[PDB]
PDB file of all heavy atoms in Angstrom:
ATOM      1  N   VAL C   1     -81.922  14.047 -48.875  1.00  0.00           N
ATOM      2  CA  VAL C   1     -80.716  14.330 -48.041  1.00  0.00           C
ATOM      3  C   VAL C   1     -81.127  14.852 -46.661  1.00  0.00           C
ATOM      4  O   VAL C   1     -82.205  15.385 -46.483  1.00  0.00           O
ATOM      5  CB  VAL C   1     -79.943  15.406 -48.805  1.00  0.00           C
ATOM      6  CG1 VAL C   1     -78.509  15.474 -48.278  1.00  0.00           C
ATOM      7  CG2 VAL C   1     -79.920  15.061 -50.297  1.00  0.00           C
ATOM      8  N   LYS C   2     -80.271  14.708 -45.686  1.00  0.00           N
ATOM      9  CA  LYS C   2     -80.606  15.201 -44.319  1.00  0.00           C
ATOM     10  C   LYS C   2     -79.958  16.570 -44.084  1.00  0.00           C
ATOM     11  O   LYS C   2     -80.072  17.150 -43.024  1.00  0.00           O
ATOM     12  CB  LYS C   2     -80.016  14.159 -43.367  1.00  0.00           C
ATOM     13  CG  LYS C   2     -81.147  13.342 -42.740  1.00  0.00           C
ATOM     14  CD  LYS C   2     -81.057  11.891 -43.216  1.00  0.00           C
ATOM     15  CE  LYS C   2     -82.390  11.476 -43.843  1.00  0.00           C
ATOM     16  NZ  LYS C   2     -82.258  11.820 -45.286  1.00  0.00           N
ATOM     17  N   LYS C   3     -79.278  17.088 -45.072  1.00  0.00           N
ATOM     18  CA  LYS C   3     -78.622  18.416 -44.913  1.00  0.00           C
ATOM     19  C   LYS C   3     -78.395  19.053 -46.286  1.00  0.00           C
ATOM     20  O   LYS C   3     -77.362  19.635 -46.549  1.00  0.00           O
ATOM     21  CB  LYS C   3     -77.285  18.121 -44.230  1.00  0.00           C
ATOM     22  CG  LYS C   3     -76.598  16.948 -44.935  1.00  0.00           C
ATOM     23  CD  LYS C   3     -76.683  15.703 -44.052  1.00  0.00           C
ATOM     24  CE  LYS C   3     -75.963  14.539 -44.738  1.00  0.00           C
ATOM     25  NZ  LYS C   3     -74.515  14.773 -44.475  1.00  0.00           N
ATOM     26  N   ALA C   4     -79.354  18.942 -47.164  1.00  0.00           N
ATOM     27  CA  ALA C   4     -79.195  19.537 -48.523  1.00  0.00           C
ATOM     28  C   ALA C   4     -79.702  20.981 -48.533  1.00  0.00           C
ATOM     29  O   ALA C   4     -80.725  21.292 -47.960  1.00  0.00           O
ATOM     30  CB  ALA C   4     -80.050  18.660 -49.439  1.00  0.00           C
ATOM     31  N   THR C   5     -78.994  21.864 -49.186  1.00  0.00           N
ATOM     32  CA  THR C   5     -79.437  23.288 -49.235  1.00  0.00           C
ATOM     33  C   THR C   5     -79.856  23.661 -50.660  1.00  0.00           C
ATOM     34  O   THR C   5     -79.072  23.599 -51.585  1.00  0.00           O
ATOM     35  CB  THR C   5     -78.212  24.100 -48.807  1.00  0.00           C
ATOM     36  OG1 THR C   5     -77.532  23.412 -47.766  1.00  0.00           O
ATOM     37  CG2 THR C   5     -78.658  25.476 -48.308  1.00  0.00           C
ATOM     38  N   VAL C   6     -81.090  24.049 -50.841  1.00  0.00           N
ATOM     39  CA  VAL C   6     -81.560  24.425 -52.206  1.00  0.00           C
ATOM     40  C   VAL C   6     -82.109  25.854 -52.198  1.00  0.00           C
ATOM     41  O   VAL C   6     -82.122  26.519 -51.182  1.00  0.00           O
ATOM     42  CB  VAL C   6     -82.671  23.428 -52.535  1.00  0.00           C
ATOM     43  CG1 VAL C   6     -82.054  22.075 -52.892  1.00  0.00           C
ATOM     44  CG2 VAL C   6     -83.589  23.265 -51.320  1.00  0.00           C
ATOM     45  N   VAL C   7     -82.564  26.329 -53.324  1.00  0.00           N
ATOM     46  CA  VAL C   7     -83.113  27.713 -53.383  1.00  0.00           C
ATOM     47  C   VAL C   7     -84.592  27.677 -53.779  1.00  0.00           C
ATOM     48  O   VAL C   7     -84.938  27.813 -54.936  1.00  0.00           O
ATOM     49  CB  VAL C   7     -82.282  28.421 -54.455  1.00  0.00           C
ATOM     50  CG1 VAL C   7     -83.018  29.674 -54.935  1.00  0.00           C
ATOM     51  CG2 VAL C   7     -80.929  28.823 -53.866  1.00  0.00           C
ATOM     52  N   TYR C   8     -85.468  27.494 -52.830  1.00  0.00           N
ATOM     53  CA  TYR C   8     -86.922  27.448 -53.157  1.00  0.00           C
ATOM     54  C   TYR C   8     -87.507  28.864 -53.189  1.00  0.00           C
ATOM     55  O   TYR C   8     -87.451  29.591 -52.217  1.00  0.00           O
ATOM     56  CB  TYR C   8     -87.558  26.631 -52.034  1.00  0.00           C
ATOM     57  CG  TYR C   8     -89.014  26.383 -52.352  1.00  0.00           C
ATOM     58  CD1 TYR C   8     -89.403  26.083 -53.664  1.00  0.00           C
ATOM     59  CD2 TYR C   8     -89.977  26.456 -51.337  1.00  0.00           C
ATOM     60  CE1 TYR C   8     -90.751  25.854 -53.959  1.00  0.00           C
ATOM     61  CE2 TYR C   8     -91.326  26.227 -51.634  1.00  0.00           C
ATOM     62  CZ  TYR C   8     -91.712  25.927 -52.945  1.00  0.00           C
ATOM     63  OH  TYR C   8     -93.042  25.701 -53.236  1.00  0.00           O
ATOM     64  N   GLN C   9     -88.072  29.256 -54.297  1.00  0.00           N
ATOM     65  CA  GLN C   9     -88.663  30.622 -54.394  1.00  0.00           C
ATOM     66  C   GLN C   9     -87.597  31.690 -54.133  1.00  0.00           C
ATOM     67  O   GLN C   9     -87.856  32.701 -53.512  1.00  0.00           O
ATOM     68  CB  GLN C   9     -89.740  30.662 -53.310  1.00  0.00           C
ATOM     69  CG  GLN C   9     -90.623  29.418 -53.423  1.00  0.00           C
ATOM     70  CD  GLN C   9     -92.078  29.842 -53.637  1.00  0.00           C
ATOM     71  OE1 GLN C   9     -92.727  29.383 -54.557  1.00  0.00           O
ATOM     72  NE2 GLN C   9     -92.619  30.704 -52.822  1.00  0.00           N
ATOM     73  N   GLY C  10     -86.400  31.475 -54.606  1.00  0.00           N
ATOM     74  CA  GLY C  10     -85.321  32.479 -54.390  1.00  0.00           C
ATOM     75  C   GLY C  10     -84.933  32.515 -52.910  1.00  0.00           C
ATOM     76  O   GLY C  10     -84.446  33.510 -52.409  1.00  0.00           O
ATOM     77  N   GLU C  11     -85.143  31.438 -52.204  1.00  0.00           N
ATOM     78  CA  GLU C  11     -84.781  31.414 -50.757  1.00  0.00           C
ATOM     79  C   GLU C  11     -83.874  30.218 -50.460  1.00  0.00           C
ATOM     80  O   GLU C  11     -84.111  29.119 -50.917  1.00  0.00           O
ATOM     81  CB  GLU C  11     -86.109  31.276 -50.015  1.00  0.00           C
ATOM     82  CG  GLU C  11     -86.365  32.536 -49.186  1.00  0.00           C
ATOM     83  CD  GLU C  11     -86.931  33.634 -50.089  1.00  0.00           C
ATOM     84  OE1 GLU C  11     -86.792  33.512 -51.295  1.00  0.00           O
ATOM     85  OE2 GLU C  11     -87.493  34.578 -49.558  1.00  0.00           O
ATOM     86  N   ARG C  12     -82.839  30.426 -49.695  1.00  0.00           N
ATOM     87  CA  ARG C  12     -81.915  29.304 -49.367  1.00  0.00           C
ATOM     88  C   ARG C  12     -82.374  28.598 -48.086  1.00  0.00           C
ATOM     89  O   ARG C  12     -82.557  29.217 -47.057  1.00  0.00           O
ATOM     90  CB  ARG C  12     -80.552  29.964 -49.160  1.00  0.00           C
ATOM     91  CG  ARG C  12     -80.281  30.937 -50.311  1.00  0.00           C
ATOM     92  CD  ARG C  12     -78.948  31.650 -50.076  1.00  0.00           C
ATOM     93  NE  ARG C  12     -79.299  33.095 -49.974  1.00  0.00           N
ATOM     94  CZ  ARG C  12     -78.427  34.003 -50.315  1.00  0.00           C
ATOM     95  NH1 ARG C  12     -77.152  33.779 -50.152  1.00  0.00           N
ATOM     96  NH2 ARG C  12     -78.831  35.137 -50.821  1.00  0.00           N
ATOM     97  N   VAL C  13     -82.561  27.307 -48.143  1.00  0.00           N
ATOM     98  CA  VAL C  13     -83.010  26.563 -46.931  1.00  0.00           C
ATOM     99  C   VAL C  13     -82.550  25.107 -47.011  1.00  0.00           C
ATOM    100  O   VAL C  13     -81.837  24.721 -47.918  1.00  0.00           O
ATOM    101  CB  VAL C  13     -84.539  26.648 -46.947  1.00  0.00           C
ATOM    102  CG1 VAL C  13     -84.981  28.024 -46.448  1.00  0.00           C
ATOM    103  CG2 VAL C  13     -85.052  26.436 -48.375  1.00  0.00           C
ATOM    104  N   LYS C  14     -82.946  24.295 -46.072  1.00  0.00           N
ATOM    105  CA  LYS C  14     -82.525  22.865 -46.099  1.00  0.00           C
ATOM    106  C   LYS C  14     -83.721  21.963 -46.413  1.00  0.00           C
ATOM    107  O   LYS C  14     -84.628  21.817 -45.620  1.00  0.00           O
ATOM    108  CB  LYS C  14     -81.991  22.581 -44.696  1.00  0.00           C
ATOM    109  CG  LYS C  14     -80.871  21.543 -44.782  1.00  0.00           C
ATOM    110  CD  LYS C  14     -79.632  22.177 -45.414  1.00  0.00           C
ATOM    111  CE  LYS C  14     -78.835  22.922 -44.341  1.00  0.00           C
ATOM    112  NZ  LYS C  14     -77.897  23.795 -45.097  1.00  0.00           N
ATOM    113  N   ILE C  15     -83.728  21.354 -47.568  1.00  0.00           N
ATOM    114  CA  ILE C  15     -84.864  20.461 -47.935  1.00  0.00           C
ATOM    115  C   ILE C  15     -85.107  19.431 -46.828  1.00  0.00           C
ATOM    116  O   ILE C  15     -86.201  18.927 -46.665  1.00  0.00           O
ATOM    117  CB  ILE C  15     -84.422  19.772 -49.227  1.00  0.00           C
ATOM    118  CG1 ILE C  15     -85.557  18.886 -49.744  1.00  0.00           C
ATOM    119  CG2 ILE C  15     -83.189  18.910 -48.950  1.00  0.00           C
ATOM    120  CD1 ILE C  15     -85.303  18.536 -51.212  1.00  0.00           C
ATOM    121  N   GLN C  16     -84.095  19.115 -46.065  1.00  0.00           N
ATOM    122  CA  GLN C  16     -84.274  18.119 -44.968  1.00  0.00           C
ATOM    123  C   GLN C  16     -85.080  18.737 -43.821  1.00  0.00           C
ATOM    124  O   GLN C  16     -85.567  18.048 -42.949  1.00  0.00           O
ATOM    125  CB  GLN C  16     -82.857  17.775 -44.506  1.00  0.00           C
ATOM    126  CG  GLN C  16     -82.189  19.025 -43.927  1.00  0.00           C
ATOM    127  CD  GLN C  16     -82.039  18.867 -42.412  1.00  0.00           C
ATOM    128  OE1 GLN C  16     -82.335  17.823 -41.866  1.00  0.00           O
ATOM    129  NE2 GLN C  16     -81.589  19.868 -41.706  1.00  0.00           N
ATOM    130  N   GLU C  17     -85.224  20.035 -43.819  1.00  0.00           N
ATOM    131  CA  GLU C  17     -85.998  20.698 -42.731  1.00  0.00           C
ATOM    132  C   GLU C  17     -87.296  21.286 -43.292  1.00  0.00           C
ATOM    133  O   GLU C  17     -88.381  20.849 -42.962  1.00  0.00           O
ATOM    134  CB  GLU C  17     -85.084  21.804 -42.211  1.00  0.00           C
ATOM    135  CG  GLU C  17     -83.993  21.193 -41.331  1.00  0.00           C
ATOM    136  CD  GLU C  17     -84.301  21.475 -39.860  1.00  0.00           C
ATOM    137  OE1 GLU C  17     -85.292  22.136 -39.597  1.00  0.00           O
ATOM    138  OE2 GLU C  17     -83.540  21.025 -39.018  1.00  0.00           O
ATOM    139  N   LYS C  18     -87.194  22.274 -44.140  1.00  0.00           N
ATOM    140  CA  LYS C  18     -88.425  22.882 -44.722  1.00  0.00           C
ATOM    141  C   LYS C  18     -89.372  21.779 -45.200  1.00  0.00           C
ATOM    142  O   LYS C  18     -90.568  21.838 -44.990  1.00  0.00           O
ATOM    143  CB  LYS C  18     -87.937  23.719 -45.905  1.00  0.00           C
ATOM    144  CG  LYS C  18     -89.133  24.153 -46.754  1.00  0.00           C
ATOM    145  CD  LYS C  18     -89.212  25.681 -46.785  1.00  0.00           C
ATOM    146  CE  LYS C  18     -90.649  26.126 -46.500  1.00  0.00           C
ATOM    147  NZ  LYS C  18     -90.546  27.576 -46.175  1.00  0.00           N
ATOM    148  N   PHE C  19     -88.840  20.771 -45.834  1.00  0.00           N
ATOM    149  CA  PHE C  19     -89.701  19.656 -46.321  1.00  0.00           C
ATOM    150  C   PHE C  19     -89.436  18.397 -45.494  1.00  0.00           C
ATOM    151  O   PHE C  19     -89.321  17.308 -46.021  1.00  0.00           O
ATOM    152  CB  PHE C  19     -89.288  19.440 -47.779  1.00  0.00           C
ATOM    153  CG  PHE C  19     -89.949  20.482 -48.650  1.00  0.00           C
ATOM    154  CD1 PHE C  19     -89.208  21.141 -49.639  1.00  0.00           C
ATOM    155  CD2 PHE C  19     -91.303  20.792 -48.469  1.00  0.00           C
ATOM    156  CE1 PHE C  19     -89.821  22.108 -50.446  1.00  0.00           C
ATOM    157  CE2 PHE C  19     -91.915  21.758 -49.275  1.00  0.00           C
ATOM    158  CZ  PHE C  19     -91.173  22.416 -50.264  1.00  0.00           C
ATOM    159  N   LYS C  20     -89.342  18.536 -44.200  1.00  0.00           N
ATOM    160  CA  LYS C  20     -89.089  17.349 -43.339  1.00  0.00           C
ATOM    161  C   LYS C  20     -90.196  16.313 -43.565  1.00  0.00           C
ATOM    162  O   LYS C  20     -90.012  15.133 -43.341  1.00  0.00           O
ATOM    163  CB  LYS C  20     -89.098  17.905 -41.907  1.00  0.00           C
ATOM    164  CG  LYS C  20     -89.620  16.853 -40.928  1.00  0.00           C
ATOM    165  CD  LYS C  20     -91.145  16.846 -40.978  1.00  0.00           C
ATOM    166  CE  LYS C  20     -91.701  16.618 -39.571  1.00  0.00           C
ATOM    167  NZ  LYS C  20     -91.666  17.957 -38.917  1.00  0.00           N
ATOM    168  N   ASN C  21     -91.338  16.748 -44.020  1.00  0.00           N
ATOM    169  CA  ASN C  21     -92.454  15.793 -44.280  1.00  0.00           C
ATOM    170  C   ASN C  21     -92.555  15.529 -45.782  1.00  0.00           C
ATOM    171  O   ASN C  21     -93.631  15.457 -46.341  1.00  0.00           O
ATOM    172  CB  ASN C  21     -93.711  16.502 -43.777  1.00  0.00           C
ATOM    173  CG  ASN C  21     -93.767  16.426 -42.250  1.00  0.00           C
ATOM    174  OD1 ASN C  21     -93.876  15.356 -41.688  1.00  0.00           O
ATOM    175  ND2 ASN C  21     -93.698  17.528 -41.554  1.00  0.00           N
ATOM    176  N   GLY C  22     -91.437  15.400 -46.443  1.00  0.00           N
ATOM    177  CA  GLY C  22     -91.465  15.159 -47.911  1.00  0.00           C
ATOM    178  C   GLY C  22     -91.752  16.480 -48.623  1.00  0.00           C
ATOM    179  O   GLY C  22     -92.233  17.422 -48.025  1.00  0.00           O
ATOM    180  N   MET C  23     -91.465  16.565 -49.891  1.00  0.00           N
ATOM    181  CA  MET C  23     -91.730  17.836 -50.624  1.00  0.00           C
ATOM    182  C   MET C  23     -93.041  17.721 -51.408  1.00  0.00           C
ATOM    183  O   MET C  23     -93.432  16.650 -51.824  1.00  0.00           O
ATOM    184  CB  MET C  23     -90.543  18.011 -51.573  1.00  0.00           C
ATOM    185  CG  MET C  23     -89.242  17.699 -50.828  1.00  0.00           C
ATOM    186  SD  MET C  23     -88.435  16.271 -51.594  1.00  0.00           S
ATOM    187  CE  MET C  23     -87.952  17.085 -53.136  1.00  0.00           C
ATOM    188  N   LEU C  24     -93.728  18.811 -51.606  1.00  0.00           N
ATOM    189  CA  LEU C  24     -95.016  18.751 -52.354  1.00  0.00           C
ATOM    190  C   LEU C  24     -94.761  18.432 -53.829  1.00  0.00           C
ATOM    191  O   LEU C  24     -93.759  18.817 -54.396  1.00  0.00           O
ATOM    192  CB  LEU C  24     -95.635  20.139 -52.207  1.00  0.00           C
ATOM    193  CG  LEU C  24     -95.992  20.385 -50.739  1.00  0.00           C
ATOM    194  CD1 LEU C  24     -95.700  21.841 -50.375  1.00  0.00           C
ATOM    195  CD2 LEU C  24     -97.479  20.094 -50.525  1.00  0.00           C
ATOM    196  N   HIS C  25     -95.667  17.729 -54.451  1.00  0.00           N
ATOM    197  CA  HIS C  25     -95.486  17.379 -55.891  1.00  0.00           C
ATOM    198  C   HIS C  25     -95.341  18.650 -56.733  1.00  0.00           C
ATOM    199  O   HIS C  25     -96.061  19.612 -56.552  1.00  0.00           O
ATOM    200  CB  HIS C  25     -96.756  16.622 -56.277  1.00  0.00           C
ATOM    201  CG  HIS C  25     -96.851  16.525 -57.776  1.00  0.00           C
ATOM    202  ND1 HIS C  25     -95.729  16.394 -58.580  1.00  0.00           N
ATOM    203  CD2 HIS C  25     -97.925  16.536 -58.631  1.00  0.00           C
ATOM    204  CE1 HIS C  25     -96.148  16.334 -59.856  1.00  0.00           C
ATOM    205  NE2 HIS C  25     -97.479  16.414 -59.945  1.00  0.00           N
ATOM    206  N   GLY C  26     -94.419  18.658 -57.656  1.00  0.00           N
ATOM    207  CA  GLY C  26     -94.231  19.864 -58.513  1.00  0.00           C
ATOM    208  C   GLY C  26     -93.268  20.842 -57.837  1.00  0.00           C
ATOM    209  O   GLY C  26     -92.679  21.689 -58.479  1.00  0.00           O
ATOM    210  N   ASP C  27     -93.102  20.737 -56.546  1.00  0.00           N
ATOM    211  CA  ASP C  27     -92.176  21.666 -55.835  1.00  0.00           C
ATOM    212  C   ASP C  27     -90.886  21.844 -56.640  1.00  0.00           C
ATOM    213  O   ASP C  27     -90.227  20.887 -56.993  1.00  0.00           O
ATOM    214  CB  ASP C  27     -91.881  20.987 -54.497  1.00  0.00           C
ATOM    215  CG  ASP C  27     -90.826  21.793 -53.735  1.00  0.00           C
ATOM    216  OD1 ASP C  27     -91.057  22.970 -53.511  1.00  0.00           O
ATOM    217  OD2 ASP C  27     -89.807  21.220 -53.391  1.00  0.00           O
ATOM    218  N   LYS C  28     -90.518  23.063 -56.934  1.00  0.00           N
ATOM    219  CA  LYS C  28     -89.268  23.292 -57.715  1.00  0.00           C
ATOM    220  C   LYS C  28     -88.183  23.890 -56.816  1.00  0.00           C
ATOM    221  O   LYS C  28     -88.365  24.924 -56.207  1.00  0.00           O
ATOM    222  CB  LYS C  28     -89.654  24.281 -58.812  1.00  0.00           C
ATOM    223  CG  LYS C  28     -90.123  23.518 -60.052  1.00  0.00           C
ATOM    224  CD  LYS C  28     -89.565  24.190 -61.308  1.00  0.00           C
ATOM    225  CE  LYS C  28     -90.575  25.212 -61.834  1.00  0.00           C
ATOM    226  NZ  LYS C  28     -91.296  24.509 -62.932  1.00  0.00           N
ATOM    227  N   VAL C  29     -87.054  23.245 -56.737  1.00  0.00           N
ATOM    228  CA  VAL C  29     -85.948  23.772 -55.883  1.00  0.00           C
ATOM    229  C   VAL C  29     -84.602  23.578 -56.588  1.00  0.00           C
ATOM    230  O   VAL C  29     -84.356  22.560 -57.204  1.00  0.00           O
ATOM    231  CB  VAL C  29     -86.010  22.947 -54.597  1.00  0.00           C
ATOM    232  CG1 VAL C  29     -87.398  23.088 -53.968  1.00  0.00           C
ATOM    233  CG2 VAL C  29     -85.746  21.475 -54.919  1.00  0.00           C
ATOM    234  N   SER C  30     -83.733  24.547 -56.506  1.00  0.00           N
ATOM    235  CA  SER C  30     -82.408  24.418 -57.181  1.00  0.00           C
ATOM    236  C   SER C  30     -81.322  24.043 -56.169  1.00  0.00           C
ATOM    237  O   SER C  30     -81.347  24.462 -55.028  1.00  0.00           O
ATOM    238  CB  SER C  30     -82.132  25.801 -57.770  1.00  0.00           C
ATOM    239  OG  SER C  30     -83.368  26.443 -58.055  1.00  0.00           O
ATOM    240  N   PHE C  31     -80.362  23.260 -56.582  1.00  0.00           N
ATOM    241  CA  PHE C  31     -79.265  22.862 -55.653  1.00  0.00           C
ATOM    242  C   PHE C  31     -78.006  23.679 -55.958  1.00  0.00           C
ATOM    243  O   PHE C  31     -77.791  24.105 -57.073  1.00  0.00           O
ATOM    244  CB  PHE C  31     -79.028  21.378 -55.933  1.00  0.00           C
ATOM    245  CG  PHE C  31     -80.120  20.566 -55.282  1.00  0.00           C
ATOM    246  CD1 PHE C  31     -81.233  20.157 -56.028  1.00  0.00           C
ATOM    247  CD2 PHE C  31     -80.021  20.221 -53.928  1.00  0.00           C
ATOM    248  CE1 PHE C  31     -82.246  19.406 -55.421  1.00  0.00           C
ATOM    249  CE2 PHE C  31     -81.034  19.470 -53.321  1.00  0.00           C
ATOM    250  CZ  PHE C  31     -82.146  19.062 -54.068  1.00  0.00           C
ATOM    251  N   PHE C  32     -77.177  23.910 -54.980  1.00  0.00           N
ATOM    252  CA  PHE C  32     -75.946  24.711 -55.236  1.00  0.00           C
ATOM    253  C   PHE C  32     -74.816  23.820 -55.758  1.00  0.00           C
ATOM    254  O   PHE C  32     -74.532  22.772 -55.212  1.00  0.00           O
ATOM    255  CB  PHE C  32     -75.568  25.311 -53.882  1.00  0.00           C
ATOM    256  CG  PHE C  32     -76.504  26.449 -53.552  1.00  0.00           C
ATOM    257  CD1 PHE C  32     -77.471  26.293 -52.553  1.00  0.00           C
ATOM    258  CD2 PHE C  32     -76.402  27.662 -54.244  1.00  0.00           C
ATOM    259  CE1 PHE C  32     -78.337  27.350 -52.245  1.00  0.00           C
ATOM    260  CE2 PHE C  32     -77.268  28.718 -53.937  1.00  0.00           C
ATOM    261  CZ  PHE C  32     -78.236  28.563 -52.937  1.00  0.00           C
TER     262      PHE C  32
END
């Protein structure tokens, strides 16, 4: 997504930004 908000490590951010270069394998993130 280009504007998805998840909770990585108990932190709220946008997977489209924090992981703008794709997410690392195993990366665990929760969606609201």
Side-chain angles (χ1 to χ4, degrees):
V1 197
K2 252 114 235 90
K3 47 253 182 79
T5 322
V6 284
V7 162
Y8 187 40
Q9 311 238 128
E11 245 81 342
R12 313 177 241 208
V13 282
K14 212 71 83 195
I15 183 163
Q16 63 110 5
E17 284 255 358
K18 168 119 227 165
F19 280 136
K20 149 279 218 82
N21 283 296
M23 316 117 70
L24 294 142
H25 166 34
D27 175 56
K28 270 221 268 261
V29 303
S30 332
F31 283 96
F32 285 108

